[PDB]
Amino acid sequence: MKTRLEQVLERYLNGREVAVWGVPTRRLLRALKPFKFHTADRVDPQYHYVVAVTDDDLTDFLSDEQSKSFQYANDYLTFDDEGGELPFERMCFNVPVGRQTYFGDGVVGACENGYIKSIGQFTSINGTAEIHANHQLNMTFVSDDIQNFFNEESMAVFQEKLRKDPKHPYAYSKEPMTIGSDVYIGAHAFINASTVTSIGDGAIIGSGAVVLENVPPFAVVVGVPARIKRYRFSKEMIETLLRVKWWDWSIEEINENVDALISPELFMKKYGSL
Amino acid sequence: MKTRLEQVLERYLNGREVAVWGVPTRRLLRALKPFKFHTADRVDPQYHYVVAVTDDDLTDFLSDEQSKSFQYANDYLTFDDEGGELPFERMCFNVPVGRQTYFGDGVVGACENGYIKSIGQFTSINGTAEIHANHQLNMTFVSDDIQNFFNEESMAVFQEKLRKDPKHPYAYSKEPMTIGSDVYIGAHAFINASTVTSIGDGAIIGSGAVVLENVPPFAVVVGVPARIKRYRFSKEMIETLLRVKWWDWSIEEINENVDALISPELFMKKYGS
Amino acid sequence: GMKTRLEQVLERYLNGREVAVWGVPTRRLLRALKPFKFHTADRVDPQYHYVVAVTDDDLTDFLSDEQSKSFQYANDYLTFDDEGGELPFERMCFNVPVGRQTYFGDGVVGACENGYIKSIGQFTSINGTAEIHANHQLNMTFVSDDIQNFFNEESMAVFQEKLRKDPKHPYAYSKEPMTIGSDVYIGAHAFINASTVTSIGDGAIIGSGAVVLENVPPFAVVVGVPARIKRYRFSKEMIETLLRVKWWDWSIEEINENVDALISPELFMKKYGS
């Protein structure tokens, strides 16, 4: 599956050479195999695309005077930033991720594990958020790695009964969860991939909240376990938001109607009734 | 002390060459000195044991077509994975850890800090679970790093009061914590090492639970603070399980009992009074 | 003119010695070390070399090596990837003064960089997973921040103007950075909201997992989500005695001379109670 960097390079390299800014990794060299690359030294954006390996390397690059002529994404990127935002849709382990949406390594892993169907646009997920599923809870054992001792027959029996568990251990027999648009998820939050299939548009998940059920659109959930504290707007305004879907607007429309985005009062004016 | 990798190599290397998959580190090369090693290029399990440095490197290795013939632990391992499971009983900073038991760096530090006496078999501890002790709560100061300014005279009287503190700051003057077999500890759960001495066999610690006292065998604890939400089985089955001790079974015994391990009702019909 | 933690240590302790790099170097390390003579570490002598371990794992390897036993912390060696690590002298983390023997993790390093923290006191212990973040705006139609990447000049001016007049201080706007006092303890995975908090008082104990939404009085112990006051460490008269005496600003000699009063609260009151 294509990394974030390979997707961006396919868009913007345009015959240039990749300039590696930092110590390379095995994952990086695997991602760069379709491209010509060399260790960075003197870089010019007309001939070079700069790939910082770590966030540390990018900080060093953007402190260098050579970085002044390089534009984000168009001319440079960070390889170890699989959850970093882009102004266009991208895949993360074959999970669609909307524009201006960012998340951390826990959600990257959740995407790799198959727990996520899609992540919406303009969605903000703190880097320490975590998404994981339950082990089986109604067998004699709760361990998962005991299966490393199962031969082919025993594993097939184990896998079949896992698929029949209505509690969806390891997120079996359930839809991967959709994370909506204009969503905010606080630091150290947790979402249970066994029992959650939807984080609705506009939802806010508080810091440290342990989410065990679907979060309705524009609901604000906090606590352990997470419960609804309030809604961001009235139900009439929420229904208007779900009809207008400003997160699908053009960049020109976003600037044209920035006053409605900045003022919920004006938004309900224009769109609530006609 | 013997790292996880050194224990694996002593058991499984079998005269092969260690093929390093990833950037070598100072800690890795010190661990690899007694053995022959090279940067990994073309590898075969007959002549090579693949050591991925980081989990990112292991991800790359398993995506490579060469890894299909390599079996976990027997033929490859991750170096920066001290909490990772092994098919045999291992040590982690002189803490016995049972087969197929894993945990994260936080619990690795707890083993190194002396907070853990042992961890059972087939136990699953989420990578973000953490086990810390309390600082001293009966002094004028709560800082620990102030002791870096203490000379020998001040350090002696500081250490002596910690030793006699009944609340066990830094887990002083108490038994190290035992963690049983078939235990599950969820994401960002917390266990207080100053007060907890046992997580019983089969205990489940839910995501977010803050555990301040011992967890009975097969109890499911949740919440802040942790409370017993339910027990996994009946009283008689718990008693039967503590006598049968399936977590000590051979690999073949486990396979021959897979239906009983899947179905608690069949387990009791077979092993119950 | 901000300086890295390593630069501050080298300026104070290097004393014409040569830096010996212990571990694989990074781009950021090479830039920080370039004003100085440095070599890869082989055989080292603290009389002659200053050992810079790159990562914490490098430091573990160095301290397990025979060559390190004559090396003194900070005076003779340091870890580069340890911006939150304690120093025996008052230091700066970005533009934030940090007291002696005070440590914290990368999240709080980032909070210093973001301008969320005014100062951190002496002998303060902050777990590495503690996190400090501000709120996004909660009075607009959207909660996203990266939507502003699509704002042209005019939309950004309107957006920024409303942020600055928001009394709830989104992104810590229109409020003071928070002052974290001395002798403070902050447990694992604790959260402090940079939008709503301006002071963590001296002696405060923030429990593990606590989400702090309000100012914490001096010597208060707070727990839970949200964090509430559970108790106070000392009596009122003792609290005011401590705030006046300020043992956390004592010299090293004064600390050792009065270790009995630091060990025994009752003796502290007998000696310093007015």
Single-letter residue type at B128: T
Q: Which residue has the tokens 């977590």?
A: B247
Superfamily of domain A89-133+168-232: Hexapeptide repeat proteins (2.160.10.10)
Interchain CB distance below 8 Å, B207 and A210:
yes
* Cα(A149)–Cα(A152) distance, integer angstroms: 10
| CB-closest option in A23, A85, A128 to C26 | A23
Instruction: Please tell me which chains touch C, using 3 or more CB pairs under 8 Å as the contact test.
Output: A, B
Q: How far is B109 from chain A (nearest CA, A)?
A: 20
Do residues B111 and B130 make contact, with C-beta atoms less than 8 angstroms apart?
A: no
Phi, then psi, of A255 in degrees rounded to 5:
-70, -35
Residue A24: cis peptide before it, omega within 30 degrees of 0: no
Three-state SS for chain B is CCCHHHHHHHHHCCCCEEEEECCCCHHHHHHHCCCCEEECCCCCCCCEEEEECCHHHHHHHHHCHHHHHCCECCCEEECCCCCCCCCCCEEECCEEECCCCECCHHHHHHHHCCCEEEECCCCEECCCCEEECCCCCCCCCCCCHHHHHCCHHHHHHHHHHHHHCCCCHHHCCCCCEEECCCCEECCCCEEECCCCCEECCCCEECCCCEECCCECCCEEEECCCCEEEEECCCHHHHHHHHHHCHHHCCHHHHHHCHHHHHCHHHHHHHHCC
Interchain CB distance below 8 Å, A27 and B60:
yes
Do residues A151 and A176 make contact, with C-beta atoms less than 8 angstroms apart?
A: no
Q: Which residue has the tokens 């976990």?
A: B72
Q: What is chain C's length?
A: 274
The tally of CA atoms less than 13 A away on the side-chain side of residue A192 is 20
Q: Looking at the domain covering C85-134+169-233, what would its CATH class be? A: mainly beta
* Cα(C85)–Cα(C52) distance, integer angstroms: 14
Residue A21's nearest CA partner among A72, A59, A73 is: A59
Do residues C158 and C187 make contact, with C-beta atoms less than 8 angstroms apart?
A: no
CB-based contacts of C124: which residues, under 8 Å, 6+ apart?
B143, C99, C102, C103, C104, C180, C181, C182, C183, C184, C185, C186
* Cα(B120)–Cα(B198) distance, integer angstroms: 11
The helix or strand, by DSSP H or E, that contains position A4, with its residue range, turns out to be helix A4-12
Q: Return the percent helix, strand and coil in chain A, to nearest 5.
A: 35, 20, 45
Do residues B229 and B222 make contact, with C-beta atoms less than 8 angstroms apart?
A: yes
The tally of CA atoms less than 13 A away on the side-chain side of residue A155 is 9
Nearest 10 degrees: CA dihedral of A162, A168, A171, A172?
40
Residues of A in contact with C191 (CB under 8 A): 186-188, 207-208
How large is the angle between the packed helices A235-244 and A264-272, nearest 10 degrees?
Answer: 70
Experimental method: X-ray
Phi, then psi, of B69 in degrees rounded to 5:
-90, 0
* Cα(A198)–Cα(A213) distance, integer angstroms: 8
Interchain CB distance below 8 Å, B59 and A130:
no
Residues of B in contact with A190 (CB under 8 A): 187-188, 207-208
* Cα(A207)–Cα(A223) distance, integer angstroms: 8
Residue B98's nearest CA partner among B82, B120, B118, B81 is: B120
* Cα(C33)–Cα(C23) distance, integer angstroms: 14
Q: How far is B100 from chain A (nearest CA, A)?
A: 6
| CB-closest option in A132, A148, A157 to B100 | A148
Residue C108's nearest CA partner among C100, C118, C117 is: C117
Helix (H, G, I), strand (E, B) or coil at A68: helix
Instruction: Please tell me which chains touch A, using 3 or more CB pairs under 8 Å as the contact test.
Output: B, C
What is the Cα Rg of chain C in Å?
22
Residue A191's nearest CA partner among A136, A102, A125, A137 is: A125
Residue C82's nearest CA partner among C98, C104, C101 is: C104
B137, two tokens? 């709560």
B31, two tokens? 């661990």
Residues of C in contact with B30 (CB under 8 A): 61, 64
Q: How far is B236 from chain A (nearest CA, A)?
A: 13
Residues of C in contact with A101 (CB under 8 A): 146
Which residue is closest to B151 within chain C, CA to CA? C256
Compute how many other C-beta atoms are within 10 angstroms of the C-beta atom of residue A112.
16
Interchain CB distance below 8 Å, C101 and B146:
yes
C201, two tokens? 């008082």
Starting at the edge strand found earlier in the chain, the sheet holding C211-212 runs C131-133, C191-193, C211-212
| CB-closest option in B60, B124, B202 to A30 | B60
Interchain CB distance below 8 Å, A139 and B255:
no
Domain ranges of chain B: 1-81, 134-167, 236-271
Interchain CB distance below 8 Å, C24 and A22:
no
The helix or strand, by DSSP H or E, that contains position A8, with its residue range, turns out to be helix A4-12
CB-based contacts of B17: which residues, under 8 Å, 6+ apart?
B35, B36, B37, B38, B47, B48, B49
Is B47 known to sit in a ligand binding site?
no
| CB-closest option in B30, B145, B208 to C101 | B145
* Cα(B90)–Cα(C20) distance, integer angstroms: 36
| CB-closest option in C22, C125, C265 to B143 | C125
Single-letter residue type at A167: K
Q: Which residue intervals of chain C are DSSP H helices?
A: 5-13, 27-33, 56-63, 106-113, 153-164, 236-245, 252-257, 259-263, 265-272
Tell how far CA A31 is from the center of its chain: 20
The tally of CA atoms less than 13 A away on the side-chain side of residue A211 is 34
Q: Which residue has the tokens 């400090």?
A: C132
Interchain CB distance below 8 Å, B130 and C188:
yes
* Cα(A207)–Cα(A226) distance, integer angstroms: 10
Single-letter residue type at B68: K
Question: CA-CA distances (angstroms) from residue C173 to B56, B265, C16, C110?
Answer: 38, 60, 44, 17
Which residue is closest to B207 within chain A, CA to CA? A210
